[PDB]
Structures are given as C-alpha cells and as structure tokens.
Design a protein around this nucleic acid. Structure first.
Ligand code: SF4
Ligand code: MG
Ligand code: MG
Ligand code: MG
Ligand code: MG
Ligand code: MG
Ligand code: MG
Ligand code: MG
Ligand code: MG
Ligand code: MG
Ligand code: MG
Ligand code: MG
Ligand code: MG
Ligand code: MG
Ligand code: MG
Ligand code: MG
Ligand code: MG
Ligand code: MG
Ligand code: MG
Ligand code: MG
Ligand code: MG
Ligand code: MG
Ligand code: MG
Ligand code: MG
Ligand code: MG
Ligand code: MG
Ligand code: MG
Ligand code: MG
Ligand code: MG
Ligand code: MG
Ligand code: MG
Ligand code: MG
Ligand code: MG
Ligand code: MG
Ligand code: MG
Ligand code: MG
Ligand code: MG
Ligand code: MG
Ligand code: MG
Ligand code: MG
Ligand code: MG
Ligand code: MG
Ligand code: MG
Ligand code: MG
Ligand code: MG
Ligand code: MG
Ligand code: MG
Ligand code: MG
Ligand code: MG
Ligand code: MG
Ligand code: MG
Ligand code: MG
Ligand code: MG
Ligand code: MG
Ligand code: MG
Ligand code: MG
Ligand code: MG
Ligand code: MG
Ligand code: MG
Ligand code: MG
Ligand code: MG
Ligand code: MG
Ligand code: MG
Ligand code: MG
Ligand code: MG
Ligand code: MG
Ligand code: MG
Ligand code: MG
Ligand code: MG
Ligand code: MG
Ligand code: MG
Ligand code: MG
Ligand code: MG
Ligand code: MG
Ligand code: MG
Ligand code: MG
Ligand code: MG
Ligand code: MG
Ligand code: MG
Ligand code: MG
Ligand code: MG
Ligand code: MG
Ligand code: MG
Ligand code: MG
Ligand code: MG
Ligand code: MG
Ligand code: MG
Ligand code: MG
Ligand code: MG
Ligand code: MG
Ligand code: MG
Ligand code: MG
Lengths: 122, 99, 208, 82, 148, 137
RNA sequence: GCUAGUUGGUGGGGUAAUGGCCCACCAAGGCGACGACGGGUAGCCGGUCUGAGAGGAUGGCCGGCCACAGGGGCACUGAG
RNA sequence: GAGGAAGAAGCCCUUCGGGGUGUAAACUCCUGAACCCGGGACGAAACCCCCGACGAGGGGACUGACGGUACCGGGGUAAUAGCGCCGGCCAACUCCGUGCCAGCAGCCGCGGUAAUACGGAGGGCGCGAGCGUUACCCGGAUUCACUGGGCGUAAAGGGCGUGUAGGCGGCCUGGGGCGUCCCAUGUGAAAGACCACGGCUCAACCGUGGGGGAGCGUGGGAUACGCUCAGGCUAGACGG
RNA sequence: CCGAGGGUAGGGCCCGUGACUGGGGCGAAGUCGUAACAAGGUAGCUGUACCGGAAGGUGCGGCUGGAU
C-alpha cells in the first residue's frame, strides 16, 4: 500500500488462536472421567487408542488421550490433563498425565519414566 | 509559558465566545509522513469583537467555563471564509456517511 | 557437581589426547595409545561424515572437557567474553585460563585439573596470602598463588613441586619452587596455549 | 518537616545508607529530595562516610532536621565545627 | 592448490515406462582462503562423478573477492531469482555469521568476519548462485576512484 | 509529473542502462545543484544548460568504465545505483548525527540543507542536516 | 450519529482557589469519519522479556503516581 | 584426587577367533563434605552523662533480635545421582520381544514375523541437583513487510464512469521562517541497563564513581527543500 | 430541596439454555450412480432461471482457463 494508506489504516497485528481452549490459560486442568473407551485412529493408522472423556473444572468437557501401555481409568476417575493433541485421533487435543490423582503410572516402565508417572525401580 | 495557538474562528453563535479551529503538523511516529491534525477550542471573546473567518491567536488562560480555558489574544488576519468553508463542507459530508 | 566419571572415554571420543590424569597420560598405558577410537560397542566401526553441527559440538565439548567445567559455567564465561571488548575467542580462553583451579594446575602444584580442584576445594591454596577454596575464583594479573603454610608438609604437593623445580611454565606465569609459590603475570594469549581446539568453531556453535 | 537521615540500601547483612534529605512522611527507602553523601556502618571500604557540606549546611540553614545518628555522622564530617 | 567443499548432493528422478531412473547433482565450492573462490554445479549418473565434475566447473568459474582484514569492503544485497542474500562488513572478533550454503563460499574465499542474511527463497542452488554474484560485485576504494 | 527530482534520477538511470553519451532533463536550479555534485564526485562528466524547442533543459553527459572482455562487452557503470529517498508521499529528514554512510563510504548521500545541497561527507563537516534527497554509487 | 446542566452568557451560592462545581434566568448552542456516542478489555509509568535494529510483548518483585478498604451514600472533626 | 591389566567377575554383542562396558571396578597411597571440641564477631555510637555555654569542641558510659550464627583455630569420616534423548530435522546403534497388535508422535511419519521410529536390555549422546513436560510471551516469521512484501496465471485491481473530503503537485523571484537543520540552556528522580573500581574467600548480590540519549520548555541562528503570502512565466491542463 | 436505594411500568444489549430443525466438518471397512480432470465419452466454466433420487440437466447471455 502507499504510505498514506498505511497512515489511514495501519497494519493488522493478527492474534494467535489457542490450541488448548479448555485450559482457560492454565498449564493443567483437573477433571473427572465420564466415558472411558477405545477409539480407532484415522488413515493410515490402525489401533485401539485409549481415550477418556473428561469433565473439567473449567466447565468444558473434552476427550483426552491416555498414554502408555495399560491404565486403570474408569468412569468417575479423577484426572489431571495437559496440552497436547494426538495427530491421528481427530478431536483429541489433550493428554492425561499418568501418576496424578486416580491416574496410575505405567506398570514395569523403565525408559522415559518421568513422562509416564513411574517411580524409580530398586 | 502560556501556550499560544493560531487558528480561524469557525463559529461565533455564542455570547462572548468563539470557536477557534487550530491546526498542527508532525511526522507520523512510524511511517514518517507529515500528517495534519486539528482541534477546536472554545475561546473567550469578552467583547464579541471577533468574526467568522478571523485567523486569531488564543492564549492558555485560567478557566472561564467548562471547555473555555483560552482567551483570544489578538487578531492575526481577517476574511478567511475559504478556511471556514472547508470545515463546514466536511461537516456537511457527514450526512452521507450514515445508515 | 562437576563430571566425576570415567575420563579416558572422553579422549577416546574426542579423537585427541586430553591430559586429564597427568601421569598415565604419558605412559604406554594411556587409552589413546592402545585404543584411539571412541568408546562403546560401535567404536571400531567406520565413521560416517559428521554434520557441521556435530563438528562444532565436538570442538565445544573438547574445549569444555579439557577444564572439567560445567556447561553452565562454560556458557556463562563464554557469554561474558561475547559481551566483553575485542575478540570473543581470545577473551574466552583468557577467562578460562584465569580460574584458580586452572592456575593451580599450570603451576605444577597438581598433576591434573581435577587434583587442582580438590587442592583448592580442600583449602590447601592461598591467593595473595588470603586462603581461597573456590575453584571458580578468577585470578588477576599481579596475584600470587601459594601453597597453604599449614599444608606445605604434604606428600602430594611435595612430589609435585619436586618435579617442577626447573620446569618452565607459561610466559604469563612464574614459579618460585622450594618456596611453593608462583605469580600470575598476565592473561594469556591463544599463542601461549596450543590447545587442540579451534575456538572459532565454538563461537559458531553458540551463534546458532 | 523535611529531615536528613539514612535511607538503607545494600542487601541483607550488608547495610549501605545514603544520607538523604526527604519529607519525613516519605517511606524510609522512598523518593528522596536530595542525596548528600553515603554511609557504611561496617567500615568495609576505607572511606565509609561522605557528606556534601556545602549542601548539608544549606538544608540545616533552610529548615531540615537531622536524626540522631545522621547528626552524629554529620558531626564526624564537621558540619557543626565553628 | 584449491580446497573443495561439497555443499549439496541431491538425487533427481525422471520417469519412463518401467519406472524412474535417477541422476545426481553436486554443488561444490573451491577456494584457497586467500581471495579466490569458485562455484560449480555438477550432474552425472553417479555421485562421485558428479562431485568431481562439479569441482571442475568450480575452477572454470572463479571470482577474486577484495578481502580487507578478513571482511568485505562494503555491504551488498543481491537477488538471484526469488533468492536474496545480504552481506555486511564486520570487525575482527565477529566470525562468519551465515547459513551453511553462504558460509562455505565466504569461508573458502578467506572471509573471516561478516554478517549475512538469506531472504526470499532459500533454495541452496539459487542462494549459492546469489552469494557468488554478490562477491563478484564487491568494489574497493581503488576501483571507485578508478571509475571516477 | 509529480516529482521532478525522481524523474531526473530515473532519466539518468534509464540512460545509463543503455549507454547514452548524454540525456536531457527539464532544467531547474535545484536540479543543477544536484548534478553539480554528481560531477564534483565523478558520477557524470558534467552538464550544460541547453535548450530544446525553446525550453530550458540540462544535457547530462554520462560516463562509464572500460569495455570488458568476454560474452558481455558492455562496460561497468559508474552510477551503479541511484534512487530517491525523500518523496512527495513521505518527506525524509535527518539531523547531522543520523546522516547515513552510503556503501561504507564508497557512496554519496545527497542532502538539501540550509547551507545548500551537500554530500553526507560535506554535511558532516559543516555539521548540518536536511532532507535526504537520494543516494548514489 | 451523540447531547437539556446539554454549550455559552448574567447574577448568586460554594471552596483555599478557577469552573456547569452548584442554582436562577437569558440565548441555542456543544461534540463527531482527525471516529463522537456505545460495546469490550485494562490501573499508568520508571522499567521488564525478546529482538541485529526497527519493532513486538509486558507492568509481579523494587521506585513514582492513581484508585479502592464487605456493597453504596454521606458529611463531621481537622493544616490536611 | 593420584595410581591402578593388553584389561577380573557380571551383563551386552560376535563370523565363536574375538569386541564392548573400562582405569571403569577391585586394590594401593594421598587429601578430608560431613560431624566432634576451642575461641567467636562486624553491623554500635549516638540520644544521655561530665568540662566547656543546654552551642563549638572535648572526655565518659549503656545497649545485638539475628547469635554462640557467620568466621578463625584444633581435630576428623571417601562421603547422595539423577533426568531426558539416540529414524530425519538433531549429538548419539545394536540384540531380543512384538508383528497395522501393543504402542510412538513437535512436524514429516513409524508398527502388516530381520523395526537404528513400539517395549526391554547393552551400548551411546546431552545435561546434572537437577532433568524433562505442559501453558504463555518475543524470536526465527521480510508470515501486517517503517526499516522490510505483494496483487496477468500462485491469495490479491473495485464491473465502469463522475465527483466530495483528503493525499499529492510545473518554471523563475522576493517576503515570512510553520515543518526541517544547527548552537546554547532548563527538564529528562532513585533503582535497573551499560563502562571502571571496589566490598562479602568467588559468584550471585551489593557499594562508589563514570558517559550519553531521544522527547518536551526556553533563548539564539540557518533558508536548500517542503509550507504559507506576493509578483512574474508557459513546457502541465484548459479554451479559440 | 437534593438524596443511597427500594417500588411500579416499559424499552435496549449480551450470555447460558430449548422439543425440534438446517446445513457443515471428520471417520470409513457401505448403497446408488459417474459430474469434473483426455474431445473425460454431451468441450468446460459461468451469472441467472426453471427442473431432477444424487452428482447434475436444460434455457438465455457471457468467458477460453477448449481438444481436433
Ligand atoms: S591416559 Fe590418555 S586417554 Fe586417559 S585421560 Fe590421559 S590422555 Fe586421556
Ligand atoms: Mg471436577
Ligand atoms: Mg500405519
Ligand atoms: Mg474409582
Ligand atoms: Mg505441543
Ligand atoms: Mg527416558
Ligand atoms: Mg519415547
Ligand atoms: Mg463564566
Ligand atoms: Mg596439555
Ligand atoms: Mg566446517
Ligand atoms: Mg565483542
Ligand atoms: Mg590437615
Ligand atoms: Mg592440551
Ligand atoms: Mg541468538
Ligand atoms: Mg529511634
Ligand atoms: Mg575486485
Ligand atoms: Mg530463487
Ligand atoms: Mg522477486
Ligand atoms: Mg569496514
Ligand atoms: Mg519461500
Ligand atoms: Mg524450505
Ligand atoms: Mg524510505
Ligand atoms: Mg460565575
Ligand atoms: Mg478543604
Ligand atoms: Mg455540568
Ligand atoms: Mg437552569
Ligand atoms: Mg431556553
Ligand atoms: Mg481532532
Ligand atoms: Mg478506525
Ligand atoms: Mg467487565
Ligand atoms: Mg526481523
Ligand atoms: Mg498492560
Ligand atoms: Mg505478572
Ligand atoms: Mg507497584
Ligand atoms: Mg467503593
Ligand atoms: Mg466502603
Ligand atoms: Mg472481603
Ligand atoms: Mg461498608
Ligand atoms: Mg580414580
Ligand atoms: Mg582384547
Ligand atoms: Mg576391553
Ligand atoms: Mg572381556
Ligand atoms: Mg569383562
Ligand atoms: Mg564454639
Ligand atoms: Mg557490634
Ligand atoms: Mg535508646
Ligand atoms: Mg559534641
Ligand atoms: Mg575444619
Ligand atoms: Mg587421617
Ligand atoms: Mg570411591
Ligand atoms: Mg533432551
Ligand atoms: Mg526405517
Ligand atoms: Mg539439539
Ligand atoms: Mg546423527
Ligand atoms: Mg501383542
Ligand atoms: Mg525384531
Ligand atoms: Mg525417537
Ligand atoms: Mg528403542
Ligand atoms: Mg547450581
Ligand atoms: Mg523446570
Ligand atoms: Mg512466535
Ligand atoms: Mg515481524
Ligand atoms: Mg513497505
Ligand atoms: Mg508475499
Ligand atoms: Mg478492471
Ligand atoms: Mg463484488
Ligand atoms: Mg498542497
Ligand atoms: Mg513545489
Ligand atoms: Mg518562499
Ligand atoms: Mg523566501
Ligand atoms: Mg521554521
Ligand atoms: Mg535535550
Ligand atoms: Mg536513570
Ligand atoms: Mg572483590
Ligand atoms: Mg543508547
Ligand atoms: Mg528551538
Ligand atoms: Mg504564483
Ligand atoms: Mg500546452
Ligand atoms: Mg486544444
Ligand atoms: Mg432516585
Ligand atoms: Mg432508581
Ligand atoms: Mg429503601
Ligand atoms: Mg441436526
Ligand atoms: Mg457435463
Ligand atoms: Mg465423465
Ligand atoms: Mg463432458
Ligand atoms: Mg447455466
Ligand atoms: Mg426438486
Ligand atoms: Mg426418484
Ligand atoms: Mg430437463
Ligand atoms: Mg450458450
Ligand atoms: Mg462480456
């Protein structure tokens, strides 16, 4: 644009859209599970990924991924969630943190334990 | 010191008070172009002796009313209806700017 | 704190000898003399071309491992040199060479910078008479790094100062042996120390 | 009344004062009217007190009122010597 | 002799019935670290051939860059197509602040202290080309006065 | 024609890119002072107040380098680059402390000051600033 | 598109003091695309984080100013 | 900490020859975090008291929460390590298990019976009383482009005129000096930032001193350019 | 007299929610046909209008970003 056009209208500073609206600005949110089931992923992957529908303290109800091998989560399981989509599970934008509230850690986990709420084995 | 401005009397339909349109220029803070801005001041005319179209000087003065904090200092030039029309023609263009 | 684990694996990784033990570093029992290839299962496999990032990282780890200093303190010394006046490369090595534990090593008080650290840390060293047990103390031109008087009758410092009675030091240093004390004359040049390190690569590493 | 006193600067277990003229209603370490030297109670540095006598006597001349130990440090500075 | 540095080795493909059949491209810069640098792009049916063929043209296409204390005389900006390169003189303690592609060309020509920036398309070929033409247009206070 | 100064810089630039011995621009006292500097700095051989069809012009005599050897005989320019800075749509003014150095020194910035049209080197000597007219190298 | 204490005047009240701050009357004015009016968000600054710079983001800790003291209204005492 | 085998066991890999963890361990000597006793602060000299005069000046005493802490001295034990990662970007590879399952995932993508990408193990890389994760800000993003971008076909010329405001505007001269430029001066608090020195054993932290700036007030000065006022001109434009 | 506010009445804006309903995105392992890409088997696209289970068809006018 001309210099006059810039004086008349300026440059638009465009805002960024949060990828985690259910968190309402927090790093984590506590919730309670309502549905605890498996969901098949999209092309070109095939599995039965473990997902929980969580009713958050922020008011939202969202679907969070349950990472690791096996879990202990059922309806009414208290749960902390964090940001993080699962690319291949459309609509899943959050992860449940293993090892907080009613989320157990992964059994017999040895590598990357801090990401799976598994304490050090003796 | 008491700030002094220069502008043209664009209204005088008040008793003992004229409306003086002051103009000013400065570079745009970011785009450097020289831009014009304008502001009206309610000017104390205690002798109703200044007329529509008079380029005058007003001086920052102790408050006379609500919005009147400037008295006319002196005449600078007379018969500037060419400037008073620009102001009025803009105000007349506003009716077309609605819905 | 500092790295305390196996130290020959460092040299074997860096492809050069870093004199991280003193005595055995000159023997035929030195690891680089027997196995001059990186540690681990794949050390004797044919190396593939390293990325430019690998190169600059390796040089940086070579320079850092020499002083046995933490990446934190390393990077902070570097950042000071970058904001300092003139050429960052020289100043970086200069501020490196000005550490108390490093000067204690250069003076032959200790056979390794590790030994020097334990000497300083255990308070067996003074600076201008004033006792200092801080390995990270910055020595300045005109100082004086002496053995603690209450420690002069120590086997290790004895044998080490024996072996230094007429050994040269850096031009930027002097050492009155038998008196167990030396002087820090000036901050060194890169010329004064032929460390197997191109330092510009370390600049380039931190400029990414 | 404007006063002349020590606003503490420095750090914990390391006090360093600025002998200062300020409104008595100001907070201790708040905006001061003027600085008229420093004070170091621990005598670390080998010149742990200083006073701009050309000014400190003015502030007395014009009305200011030093505190007890500000006065004493103004005494060891010779603002009262006749 | 001249030091060489491979910058890019890519494999292109072309289609026929029966399938695709490949070919390799080598971006090589050569120089002495003293004021002489050349760039050549080599294509051949196998990697070593293309690499060697690239070193050949690099010597057949050189440029003398007016080094002054290890920096360039004046700042320059050149566009090659949609790629833009920026070079700015820099003092002793600086280094060569440049992406991998322009770094190789400045380093081998003896530049030790320069600020750079790629803008526009960052295609390595067009960026390598744009760096050569930037060096090629550098001028000394001499040539300035010679022209006037 | 909204910017005679940029029209003259462009007349030169269009003329030098086809290697003309000269090209004529409509004349004015401010233009001559600008050409006065292009000569005194060697960007041009000089000018002369000619007339065309009864109208006062400025015939600017261009200057190039030696012929070259290779596929492109065309010789290097002397004015590689000349462009307007301050414009009717955006006046540009610098004080003496912010006067830029064209091409590290090998180039000239042309200013208009209340001590007349001056180079950036001239302007720094006299210690004045002004409207940054253009830059040349 | 906005405006009836609304904009100006005369008189008086009121204050430490100017003023529609308040009141009575007189006049019909005042403001707006250079964004009035309305909606939303926010205490502002020294500074802070980042950035080659320009800029972007931010105002917790310390310093300055403002505002508030369960939600509102009010005056009394008083140099305040 | 030094020394310490062509190199123990165990575990991992192997073409079964051997290779690795690895001077790493064991072992030897040296030092001595912790803790055990001795002493133990700086911050505190004023107000007051006496002589002087209820002043100048001089002399006298009381007082430490932190604290029996810091610290000094004497002795004195080898004395916590963990976290992430190793398909590419990106530094670091092998064996087994699994077999589009279980699972990984920042992006591209991994897994369908020889997976450097899943899970473990050995090994390796990176940091270290921390290491990773999530959220958010600036950066990379010249990806709102003033510096520093674009619009035939990539996203992008208004369907076309006419025209209001506004933005912008030819050659020469003079007046004014609004913009603009220069000089002087006031303001630009302290802290912070920066350079130097110094005080805590270093540093963090802190003290002392040093240099500015924009911006705005004021006085003075310049007049090329832009603006304004005045007078000319005909190359734009309009008319005959 | 003014006056916190309470009360009566009538307007304006915003949020949450609602039997039911409209289309949209995604999933994909289905049913129907095959509209577009080749002259895509009726050159295509297009504003509008009327029509058809559906992609779409046809009329009128326009475009070439149409093969021969
Ligand atoms: S013995 Fe050799 S490998 Fe081991 S630390 Fe000394 S120099 Fe390095
Ligand atoms: Mg809940
Ligand atoms: Mg798959
Ligand atoms: Mg339960
Ligand atoms: Mg994420
Ligand atoms: Mg891990
Ligand atoms: Mg993992
Ligand atoms: Mg009045
Ligand atoms: Mg050595
Ligand atoms: Mg390299
Ligand atoms: Mg530097
Ligand atoms: Mg001892
Ligand atoms: Mg060495
Ligand atoms: Mg950086
Ligand atoms: Mg007291
Ligand atoms: Mg040359
Ligand atoms: Mg390109
Ligand atoms: Mg381009
Ligand atoms: Mg230079
Ligand atoms: Mg691009
Ligand atoms: Mg790319
Ligand atoms: Mg510009
Ligand atoms: Mg009145
Ligand atoms: Mg009062
Ligand atoms: Mg009012
Ligand atoms: Mg009334
Ligand atoms: Mg009326
Ligand atoms: Mg306005
Ligand atoms: Mg707007
Ligand atoms: Mg609100
Ligand atoms: Mg940028
Ligand atoms: Mg804010
Ligand atoms: Mg905050
Ligand atoms: Mg605050
Ligand atoms: Mg309130
Ligand atoms: Mg209240
Ligand atoms: Mg409360
Ligand atoms: Mg209350
Ligand atoms: Mg050992
Ligand atoms: Mg062997
Ligand atoms: Mg072995
Ligand atoms: Mg073995
Ligand atoms: Mg073994
Ligand atoms: Mg004791
Ligand atoms: Mg004490
Ligand atoms: Mg007392
Ligand atoms: Mg006395
Ligand atoms: Mg002890
Ligand atoms: Mg012992
Ligand atoms: Mg041990
Ligand atoms: Mg990591
Ligand atoms: Mg693979
Ligand atoms: Mg990395
Ligand atoms: Mg790698
Ligand atoms: Mg299974
Ligand atoms: Mg397998
Ligand atoms: Mg991985
Ligand atoms: Mg694995
Ligand atoms: Mg630490
Ligand atoms: Mg953390
Ligand atoms: Mg960003
Ligand atoms: Mg940006
Ligand atoms: Mg632009
Ligand atoms: Mg673009
Ligand atoms: Mg058109
Ligand atoms: Mg339209
Ligand atoms: Mg105009
Ligand atoms: Mg003009
Ligand atoms: Mg004039
Ligand atoms: Mg004039
Ligand atoms: Mg002026
Ligand atoms: Mg100033
Ligand atoms: Mg300051
Ligand atoms: Mg010190
Ligand atoms: Mg500055
Ligand atoms: Mg001035
Ligand atoms: Mg005229
Ligand atoms: Mg004509
Ligand atoms: Mg005609
Ligand atoms: Mg009411
Ligand atoms: Mg009410
Ligand atoms: Mg009530
Ligand atoms: Mg529905
Ligand atoms: Mg069809
Ligand atoms: Mg078809
Ligand atoms: Mg068809
Ligand atoms: Mg149709
Ligand atoms: Mg129908
Ligand atoms: Mg049907
Ligand atoms: Mg039909
Ligand atoms: Mg038709
Ligand atoms: Mg048509």
């Amino acid at each position: 644009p001309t210099i006059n056009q810039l004086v008349r209208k300026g440059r638009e500073k465009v805002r960024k859209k949060s990828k985690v609206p259910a968190l309402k600005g927090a790093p984590f949110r506590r919730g309670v599970c309502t549905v605890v089931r498996t969901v098949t992923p999209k092309k070109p992957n095939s599995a039965l990924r473990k997902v929980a529908k969580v009713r958050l303290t922020s008011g939202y109800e969202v679907t969070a991924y349950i990472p690791g091998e096996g879990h202990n989560l059922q309806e009414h399981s208290v749960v902390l969630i964090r940001g993080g989509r699962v690319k291949d599970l459309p609509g899943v934008r959050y992860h449940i943190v293993r090892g907080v509230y009613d989320a157990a850690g992964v059994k017999d986990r040895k590598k990357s334990r801090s990401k799976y709420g598994t304490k050090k084995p003796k | 010191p008491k700030k002094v401005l220069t502008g043209v009397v664009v209204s005088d339909k008040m008793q003992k008070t004229v409306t003086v349109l002051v103009e000013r220029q400065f570079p745009h803070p970011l785009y450097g172009k020289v831009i014009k801005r304008s502001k009206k001041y309610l000017a104390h005319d205690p002798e109703e002796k200044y007329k529509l179209g008079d380029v005058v000087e007003i001086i920052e003065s102790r408050p006379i009313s609500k919005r009147k904090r400037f008295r006319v200092l002196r005449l600078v030039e007379s018969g500037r209806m060419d400037l008073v029309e620009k102001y009025l023609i803009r105000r007349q263009n506003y009716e077309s700017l609605s819905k | 704190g500092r790295y305390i684990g196996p130290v020959c694996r460092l040299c074997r990784r860096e492809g050069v000898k870093l004199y991280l033990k003193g005595e055995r570093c000159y023997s035929p029992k030195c690891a680089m003399e027997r196995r001059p290839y990186p540690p681990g299962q794949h050390g004797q496999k044919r190396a593939r071309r390293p990325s430019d990032y690998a190169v600059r990282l390796r040089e940086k780890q070579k320079l850092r491992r020499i002083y046995g200093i933490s990446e934190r303190q390393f990077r902070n010394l570097f950042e000071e040199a970058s904001k300092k006046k003139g050429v960052t490369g020289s100043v970086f090595l200069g501020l490196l060479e000005s550490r108390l534990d490093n000067v204690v090593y250069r003076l032959g008080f200790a056979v390794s910078r590790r030994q020097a650290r334990q000497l300083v840390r255990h308070g067996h060293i003074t600076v201008n008479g004033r006792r200092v047990d801080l390995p990270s103390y910055r020595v300045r031109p005109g100082d004086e790094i002496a053995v603690a008087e209450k420690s002069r009758n120590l086997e290790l410092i004895r044998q080490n100062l024996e072996a230094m009675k007429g050994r040269k030091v850096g031009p930027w240093l002097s050492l009155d042996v038998e008196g167990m004390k030396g002087k820090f004359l000036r901050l060194p040049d890169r010329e004064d120390l032929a460390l197997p390190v191109n330092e510009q690569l370390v600049i380039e590493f931190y400029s990414r | 009344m404007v006063k002349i006193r020590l606003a503490r600067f420095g750090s914990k277990h390391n006090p360093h004062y600025r002998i200062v003229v300020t409104d008595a209603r100001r907070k201790r370490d708040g905006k001061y009217i003027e600085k008229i030297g420093y004070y170091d109670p621990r005598k670390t540095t080998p010149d742990w007190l200083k006073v701009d006598v050309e000014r400190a006597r003015y502030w007395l001349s014009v009305g200011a009122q030093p505190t007890d130990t500000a006065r004493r440090l103004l005494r060891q500075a010779g603002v009262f010597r006749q | 002799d001249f030091e060489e540095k491979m910058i890019l080795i890519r494999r292109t493909a072309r289609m026929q019935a029966g399938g695709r059949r490949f070919r390799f491209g080598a971006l090589v810069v050569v120089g002495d670290r003293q004021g002489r640098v050349g760039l050549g792009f080599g294509k051949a049916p196998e990697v070593p051939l293309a690499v060697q063929k690239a070193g050949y043209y690099a010597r057949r296409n050189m440029v003398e860059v007016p080094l002054q204390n290890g920096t360039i005389p004046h700042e320059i900006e050149v566009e090659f197509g949609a790629s833009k390169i920026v070079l700015k003189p820099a003092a002793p303690g600086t280094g060569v602040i440049a992406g991998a592609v322009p770094r190789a060309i400045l380093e081998l020509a003896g530049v030790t202290d320069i600020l750079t920036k790629e803008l526009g398309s960052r295609n390595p070929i067009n960026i390598a080309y744009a760096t050569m033409e930037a060096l090629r247009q550098l001028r000394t206070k001499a040539d300035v006065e010679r022209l006037r | 024609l909204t910017d005679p100064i940029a029209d003259m810089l462009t007349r030169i630039r269009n003329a030098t890119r086809v290697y003309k011995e000269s090209t004529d621009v409509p004349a004015s006292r401010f233009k001559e002072e600008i050409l006065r500097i292009l000569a005194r700095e060697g960007f041009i051989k000089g000018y002369e107040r000619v007339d065309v069809d009864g109208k006062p012009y400025l015939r600017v005599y261009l200057k190039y380098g030696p012929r070259r050897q290779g596929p492109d005989p065309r010789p290097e320019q002397v004015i590689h680059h000349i462009r307007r800075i301050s414009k009717p749509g955006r006046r540009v003014y610098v004080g003496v402390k912010e006067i830029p150095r064209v091409r590290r020194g090998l180039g000239i910035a042309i200013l208009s000051t209340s001590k007349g049209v001056l180079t950036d080197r001239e302007a720094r000597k006299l210690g004045v600033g002004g409207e940054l007219i253009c830059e040349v190298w």
